Amino acid sequence: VDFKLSPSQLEARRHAQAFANTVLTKASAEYSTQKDQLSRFQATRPFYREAVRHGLIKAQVPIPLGGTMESLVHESIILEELFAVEPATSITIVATALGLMPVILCDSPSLQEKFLKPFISGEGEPLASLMHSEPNGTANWLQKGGPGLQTTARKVGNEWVISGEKLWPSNSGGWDYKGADLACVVCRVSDDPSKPQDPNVDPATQIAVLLVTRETIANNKKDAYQILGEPELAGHITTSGPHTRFTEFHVPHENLLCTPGLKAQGLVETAFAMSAALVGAMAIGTARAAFEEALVFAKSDTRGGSKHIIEHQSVADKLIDCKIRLETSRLLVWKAVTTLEDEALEWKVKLEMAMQTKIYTTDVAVECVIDAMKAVGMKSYAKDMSFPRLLNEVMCYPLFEGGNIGLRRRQMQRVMALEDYEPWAATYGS
Amino acid sequence: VDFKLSPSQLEARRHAQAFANTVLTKASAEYSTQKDQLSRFQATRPFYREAVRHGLIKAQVPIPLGGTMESLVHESIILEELFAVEPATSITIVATALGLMPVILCDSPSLQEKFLKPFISGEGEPLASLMHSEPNGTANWLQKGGPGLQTTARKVGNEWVISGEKLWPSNSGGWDYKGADLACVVCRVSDDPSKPQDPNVDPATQIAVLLVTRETIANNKKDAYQILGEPELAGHITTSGPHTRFTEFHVPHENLLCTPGLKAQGLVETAFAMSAALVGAMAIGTARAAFEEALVFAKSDTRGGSKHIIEHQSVADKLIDCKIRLETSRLLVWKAVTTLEDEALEWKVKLEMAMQTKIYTTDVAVECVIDAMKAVGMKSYAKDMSFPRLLNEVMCYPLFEGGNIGLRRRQMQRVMALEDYEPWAATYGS
Amino acid sequence: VDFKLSPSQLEARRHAQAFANTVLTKASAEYSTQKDQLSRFQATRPFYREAVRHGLIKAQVPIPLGGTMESLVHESIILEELFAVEPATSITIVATALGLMPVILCDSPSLQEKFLKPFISGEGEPLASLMHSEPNGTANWLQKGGPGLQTTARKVGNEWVISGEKLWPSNSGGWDYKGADLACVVCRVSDDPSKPQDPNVDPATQIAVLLVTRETIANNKKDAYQILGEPELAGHITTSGPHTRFTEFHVPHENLLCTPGLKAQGLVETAFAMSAALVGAMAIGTARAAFEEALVFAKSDTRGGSKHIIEHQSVADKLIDCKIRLETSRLLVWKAVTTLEDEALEWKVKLEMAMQTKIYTTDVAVECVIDAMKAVGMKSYAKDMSFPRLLNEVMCYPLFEGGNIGLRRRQMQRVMALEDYEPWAATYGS
Amino acid sequence: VDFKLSPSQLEARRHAQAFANTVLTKASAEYSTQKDQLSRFQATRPFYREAVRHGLIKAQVPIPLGGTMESLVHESIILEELFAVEPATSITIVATALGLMPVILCDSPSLQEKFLKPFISGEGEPLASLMHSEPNGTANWLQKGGPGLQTTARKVGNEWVISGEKLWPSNSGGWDYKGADLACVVCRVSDDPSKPQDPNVDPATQIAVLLVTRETIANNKKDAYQILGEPELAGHITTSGPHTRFTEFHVPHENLLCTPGLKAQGLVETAFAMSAALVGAMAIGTARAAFEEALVFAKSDTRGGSKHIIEHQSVADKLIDCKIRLETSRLLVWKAVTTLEDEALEWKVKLEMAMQTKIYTTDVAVECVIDAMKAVGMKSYAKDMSFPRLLNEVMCYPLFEGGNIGLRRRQMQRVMALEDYEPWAATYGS
C-alpha cells in the first residue's frame, strides 16, 4: 500500500492541466453565443479537434490495442483536471471512451482492429457512443417478467434489422446527425417487435450489441434513422445525446459484437461498471472547482468585517466538509479503478467497488458545490462566478451513468444478497 | 390550538391559485424570448399590472393602513401557491412588500398616508425596494470596530446627502432604471465618508433610513444615481436587483423615515425578521412544485418495468422525505408569523422564531427538489420538466433574505446567548 | 389558526411538571440498585401508584367513557414533561394507554364498562398491554403470501384457544408475571394452528383481538401462559416487555373484542396510529432534556477559554439545529393529534399524518441528542451528566412503536400510492 | 499507486484476529460481574498480560528503538481487528502507544533507551499514559490570553514541582492507583501558580512535559498525588482514565522530556496528530462489527416476510450507506498514516490530513451503527445483540482523542487559513 504518483502520472496531470488552461478556457466564448444544444455542441468541434491533436482520444484505448492508455489512475487524474476547468469537450472524450469500451473489451482482435482505427490515429474528430438508454427508461431492462428494452433487433438473412427509439446516449448522432464514427447499439432480440417480451425468458439472454457507423447509417433509407430531437439539459449544455428513431435499420451480421445473450450483457455490464468508477473523477473535478473558488474567496474577502471569512467557524466548517468529501471521493475512485484492473479478483468484487464509488462520489459532489455556495453567500448566485454553472453541471452526476436510486443501488444490493458475498475482498483478498 | 382554516383563508388560496394558473403561466412565453435579466424583468410588467388589478399589491398592506392584508397566515397561503407555479412577478410582489415594510412599521400616519397611497390604489405597476445589501457584503454591517455600511449619509443644511453603492436590492431601479416608486435606502450616518467608522460607537446608533422616490432622482443630476450593472442570476431570472451608485445624492429631510440610530436599525431588523418568516412560504411553494411533479410522475410511470415507480421502497423514501420537509416547513412558517403577530411576546422571542423558520425551511427546500429530481431520475435533468428551473430557483432561498450562515444563524445565536433566553416562550409562555 | 394554550393545557403542563419533579426524580434512587429488567420494573411500582393517585392513569381514558382525558394536545403536553425528566413509570403509563386503546375505540358499551373500570377508579396499580409484537417480527404481518402472525386462535365451542408467542409488549406480564390487568392479544385466525396461512385470503380478514385479564390466566392451567424471558434493553431499563408463550390458552368468546377481520385489524391500526403520533412527544421530551442540558452548559462553561462556549459558531450551530428539530417536531405532533381528532377527515389523511409524525420526530430526536453531546464534548460521555441515559433512551424511538424502516414508511408509502391520495388534505381540506 | 497488502500486513491481520477471537472474547465473562469502572479495568489485567505475551505492546514501538512496529498501516490493520471484536484491553494498548509517543518522537537516544525498556520487554503488564486533559477542558489550552492548562510546573532547585488536576488520561493511575509505569504529564510552566497565565506570552512557549513513573510517585508524600475519582463511562466500561490531583508533586530534572516551550508543544501536537489518524481504525472496527452483524441478520432473516430483509430496498440502502462509510474511512486512515510517514512532506500537510481523518471516520461511524440498528429493527435494542455495546462505544470517537468541534476542526481551520496552504500537497506534491 502506497499512494505515491510515478513521473508518468505527474506528466499526465501536467499535460491535462496544460490543455485545460490553454485550450479549454477559450471554448466558452464560442459556445455561449450559440442558440440551442447542438449549435453549442458543434461550437465545440475545434476543441475536440485539439483534444485529438493533443493525443487525448488515443489515450482512451489500451496500449495492447494501439492506444496510449497507461492506466485507469492516469485516466482518473486527467479527467479530474479537465472537469476542474471545463466540462465542454471533456465530456465528449468520456462519451467516446465509453463508446469504445465494449469493443476494447471483446474477444475479437479483428473487430478491435476494424473499429478502433480512427481513434488511435491522431487525426480528425472521431466519436463513439454506447447507445443503451431509451425514452421509457432503463433501470429495469433486465427484470424478468417486464417490457425489457424497446430497441429491438431481428435477423433477416445475413443482416440484422433494428426497430426502436433511444434517448440520452452522448455523441450518438455525430457532429452532423449523420451518426457517430462508432456506436454500440444495445438491443433486445425480438423476431417479432410486435410481441411483448416472453415473461419466461431471462432478459439477459436476449441481449445483442450491434456496431453502427456513419457507413451503416448511409447504406440505409434516409428515414431508417432519424433524429427526433435533442434534450435541452440543465447543465453540460454543449453535449449531444439526442432522441433517435430506428425504423427498419439494416446492419451486417459482421457488425455483431459477440454472441447475443449473457456474453453481450457481460460487455455492457463491464463497460458500464468502468464508467461508473471513472465518473467520480468528473464529480471530483466539478466539486473541486466549487471548493477552490470558495476557498480562495474565503481566504481573501472579509465580507464587510475585520477578518477574512475563513476565520468564521461556520465558514471553515462548510470548507472542511467539502475538502473531506473531495479527499475520500478521490481515494475511492483510485481504489475502484485499481480494483477493476486487478486480475486476481472476481468480477462481483470489482462490481461492488464500482457501484460504491459511483454512488458516493456523485451524491457527495452535490453536497460539496452547495456548501461552497452557502459559504460564499449571495455572490455565489450571480453568473460572474462559476457556481451557477457548477451547480447545474454537478446535478448530472447522481442522475447519469445509471442513476443511483434505480440502477447502481440495485446492482450493489444484488451482489450483497449473494450467499458467497465477501464485503472486504477488494482489501484483504479471498 | 387549532389548524382549521377560515372561509377568508380558503378564498385567499382559491384566489391565488386562480391567478397563478390563468395569469402567471402565460409569463414564460414572454420572458423566455429575452436576452438579459432586465429585459426579462421588463417583459414581466403586464403580469405585475394584472396582479395589482387582482388586489395582490394592495394585499401587501395592512387593513388599518388602508390595504387589504388580512393576516400573515393569509399572506403565507397566497405566496406558497404563487411560488408553486411561477416565481416571476410573484417575487416582485414580495419585494414590494419588504420595500413597504419600514413604512408600514413606522409610527407616523402622515408618512404612511403619503407614501403608501400608490400601493393601495388598485392602479399602475408601482414598485418598492428595501435597499440594504452592498457590494462588499452586509453580514457584518453591525459589527463594532468594522467598516459598517458603505452607503453613508450626511446632513447638509435641510437635506441628506447619500454617497455609495447598493447591490442586490430587488426592484430598486424600477421598470426603466429611473427608480422604484418607493425605495427605503439604509445608510450609515458619516460626516466625512472618506474616514472609517469610529471603532467606538455602536454601529446600530448610526443607522438612517431615507425614502428615495422617482421624483428625488428626477430632482438630482443624472450622474448622482447610476445603475452600474444588473447581475445575471442562476434562477429567478426575471427579477431585477441592480448595482446602483449614489454620488452626492440629495434627499429632503422630510424623507427621513425617522431619527437616525437605534429606532431606524430596529425598523430594518423588524422588516427583515418578518420577511425571514415569509420567505419560507416561497421555499415551500418551489419545493411543493418539485415534490408534486415527482409524485405525479412516480404514480404514472413504470420506467420500463412492471409496476409504477412509487412501488419501489427507495423511490417512496425520497417522496416521504420531501413530504415531511414540506409539512414541517409549513407548520413552522405558520407558527412564526403567528408569533410575530402576538402582542404579548417579547421581540427577542419573535426574532428567534423567525430566524429558525428561515434557516430550516430554506435549507430543507433544497434537499427537497434534489431528492425529487433523484427519484424521477434522468428525465428530471432536461428542460421539458420543471426541475432544472426549480433547482436554480431553490438555491436562492438559503442565500438570500439574509443568508443562513452569515446572518440568520448569528442573529439566532445572539439571542440564545442572552442571560434572559427562554427557549420555549412562544409555545408555553413566559 | 391558533397555537395559544388554554388555561387547562397550561394547568396540565404545571401538573405533569410538578409530578415529575417531586415524584419521578426519586425513582432512580430505587431502581438503579437493582439487578435485572424486572426488578427495575418492580422498583417502579410505588411511582406508578403515585401516578394513579395523581389521576394520570385516568387521564388516558376519555371523559365519555368515565376517564379524564381532556384532549390529545393535553396528552402530548403531559408526555413531553414526563419524558423531559424521567421515562421510568412514564413509559408504563403510555403503555397502559395503548393497551386500553382498542377497548376505548371499539363501539361496545358493555366491554368498555367492564374492562376499563379498574383504570378509572383512581386506585391500585392496574396495567394494560397491547400484545401485538412477536419473536419473528411483525413488519410483514399483513403480507398476503406470508406466514402472518404466529399467535393464532381457533374457536372451540363457546370459547377461543390461543397458541403462539408474544415478545416486547410493555407491561404484558403485569408486576408479577401473573398478567397485565387488561391485555389485548392480537391473533391470526386458524382452525388448525399448524396449517400455513392461506395465500389467497387477504391477511387483514383473519385478525382477532382477545382480551386477557389476570383472571383469564388464573382459570387457565399454569403452563398455558409462561413468561419465557425479559429482554435486557439498551435504555428504558425499567420497562417490562416479556417473552410470552401461549400453549392451548383458554379465552371466553365474550372476551372477544369485535368480529374478526377488517374491523379487528382496523382497531389495531387506529390504536397504533394514535400511539404513532403520541410517541413523538416522548422523543421530544428526551431530545429536550439533552438540548436543555447542553444549552445551560454552553451558557455557563468556557471550557478553559475566555468565553462561554455558546459564543463559538460551531457550538451555536449544533444547538440551533437541536432547537429547530424540537420546534418542528412539537408542531408536527400537535398537528397530528389534532388531525386525528377531526371527524371531518377520512382515515388515510390521518394515518398518513400520524406516520409522518412518528418517522420525523423519532429520527430527528436521535440527531438532536448526538449533536447536544458533541456540543458539550468529552464531559457528555460520563454518567454525572444525563447524556449516557438519554443516548440509550432516544434510540428506542425510531425502532419501537412500529419501526420506521419496515412499518411506518410502508404504511405511509401504501397511502401515497392510492389513486385518490390528497397530499395536503389535513391542511387545506378536499 | 498501489493498494495491495504485503504478506506481513496479512500476517499482522491474521495474528490480530487470532488474538481477538481466542483471547479477547473471554474478557466479557470477567469484566461483566464487576460493579464499577476500576473493578472492570482491573478484571482486564489478564488480557493485557496476554497482549504483552503476544508482543502487542512491543509492536507499539518502532523497530530502530527496539520495538516491533513494522508500519502505521500494519498498526491500523491490527487495531481494526481488535476493535471489530472487543475494545476492552485493545483500548489500553493504544492508550499505552500514545503515552509512549512523546518519548518515541523525541530526539534523545538515552531517554528512549531508559524509558522504553519495560515496553519492549515482552514481560509484565506495563502501562503508559499521555496526561494532557483537565477537569476544566482543553480545546483552548493554546489560546493566547486565556487561562491555559491548570496543571502547572515550576523549577525548584534541581526538581520540578507540579500543581493541579488531570481528568480522562487513559491508564494514568496504573492497575492500582499508584500510577502508570510511564505517564507523560503536560504542564504550563508557572513560577507562581496562583497568578494568571501572562496574556502577553504565546501559551505554546510555556509548555513542559514531565515523565512520571511509579517511582516518582513513590518518592512523594501520600497527598502529593491523589486519585479523586473515576468517571463512569457510557461505553468503554473497562478502561481507566481517572481524576488526578497533583499537590506539590516533585519530579527530577532528568525527567523533563525536553526544553520547555515550542519543542515540547510540538512533541504533544505530533503525538496527538498520530492518534487522531489511527483512531479512525478504532472507529472502523466498532462500525464494522455493527455493519457485519446487521448484514448477517439481513441475509438470514425474513422478519415474518417471505424474503430475507436485505431484499427490501430500504434495508439494503442502509447497509449500502454503512459499507460506503467503512470503505471510504479505511482508505482515508491508510492515506493519513502513510502521509505521516512521508519524510518528503511538510508538517501542515500531514497535520491537515490527520485532522480530516479523525473528523470523518469518527462522525461517519456513529451514522454507521445507528443505520445498522435501524435495518435490524426492534431486535438491535436488546443486549443479546451487540448493538447496545457498539452504540455507546462508537459515540466516544467523535468526542475523545480531541473532540471534532473544539479541537480537530479548529486545528484544520488554522492550516486552511495559512497563506501558503496547499490543499493537495499530500496527493499531488508542492
Ligand SMILES: Cc1cc2nc3c(=O)[nH]c(=O)nc-3n(C[C@H](O)[C@H](O)[C@H](O)COP(=O)(O)OP(=O)(O)OC[C@H]3O[C@@H](n4cnc5c(N)ncnc54)[C@H](O)[C@@H]3O)c2cc1C
Ligand atoms: C450528459 C448525459 C450523458 C449521457 N450519456 C449516456 C451514454 O453515453 N450512454 C447511455 O446509454 N446513456 C447516457 N445518458 C443516460 C444516463 O446514463 C442515465 O442514467 C440512464 O438514462 C439511466 O437513467 P435512470 O437511472 O434515471 O433510470 P430510469 O429508467 O430513467 O428510472 C428513473 C428513476 O426511476 C426510479 N426507478 C426505476 N426503476 C427502479 C427500480 N427498479 N428500483 C428503484 N427505483 C427505480 C429511480 O428513481 C430512478 O431514478 C446520458 C445522460 C446525460 C444527462
Ligand SMILES: Cc1cc2nc3c(=O)[nH]c(=O)nc-3n(C[C@H](O)[C@H](O)[C@H](O)COP(=O)(O)OP(=O)(O)OC[C@H]3O[C@@H](n4cnc5c(N)ncnc54)[C@H](O)[C@@H]3O)c2cc1C
Ligand atoms: C432574488 C434576490 C432578491 C434580493 N432582494 C433584496 C432586497 O430586497 N433587499 C436587499 O437589501 N437585498 C436583497 N438581495 C440580497 C440578499 O438579501 C442577501 O441575502 C444579502 O446580500 C446578504 O447576503 P449574505 O447573507 O451572503 O451576506 P454577505 O455579507 O455577502 O457574506 C456572505 C458569506 O460570507 C460568510 N460570512 C460573512 N460574515 C460572516 C459572519 N460574521 N459569520 C459567519 N459567516 C459569515 C457567510 O458564509 C456568508 O454567507 C436579494 C438577492 C436576491 C438573489
Ligand SMILES: Cc1cc2nc3c(=O)[nH]c(=O)nc-3n(C[C@H](O)[C@H](O)[C@H](O)COP(=O)(O)OP(=O)(O)OC[C@H]3O[C@@H](n4cnc5c(N)ncnc54)[C@H](O)[C@@H]3O)c2cc1C
Ligand atoms: C476513552 C477515553 C480515552 C481518553 N484518553 C485520553 C488520553 O489518553 N489523554 C488525554 O489527555 N485525554 C484523554 N481523554 C480526553 C479526550 O482526548 C478529550 O477529547 C479531551 O478532553 C478534549 O475534549 P473536548 O474536545 O470535548 O474539549 P473541551 O475543552 O472539553 O470542549 C468541549 C466542547 O466545547 C466546545 N468548545 C470549546 N472550545 C471551543 C472552541 N474554541 N471552538 C469551538 N468549540 C469549542 C466544543 O463543542 C467542544 O466539544 C480520553 C477520554 C475518553 C472518553
Ligand SMILES: Cc1cc2nc3c(=O)[nH]c(=O)nc-3n(C[C@H](O)[C@H](O)[C@H](O)COP(=O)(O)OP(=O)(O)OC[C@H]3O[C@@H](n4cnc5c(N)ncnc54)[C@H](O)[C@@H]3O)c2cc1C
Ligand atoms: C420499550 C419498548 C416497548 C414496546 N412496546 C410494545 C407494545 O406495547 N406492543 C407491541 O406490540 N410491541 C411493543 N414493542 C415492539 C415495537 O413496537 C417494535 O417496533 C415491533 O416489534 C416491530 O419492530 P420492527 O419495526 O423493527 O419490525 P421487525 O419485523 O422486527 O423488522 C425489523 C427490521 O427488518 C426490516 N424489515 C422487515 N420487514 C420489512 C419490509 N417489508 N420493508 C423494509 N424493511 C423491512 C426493517 O429494517 C426493520 O426495521 C416495544 C418495544 C420496546 C423496545
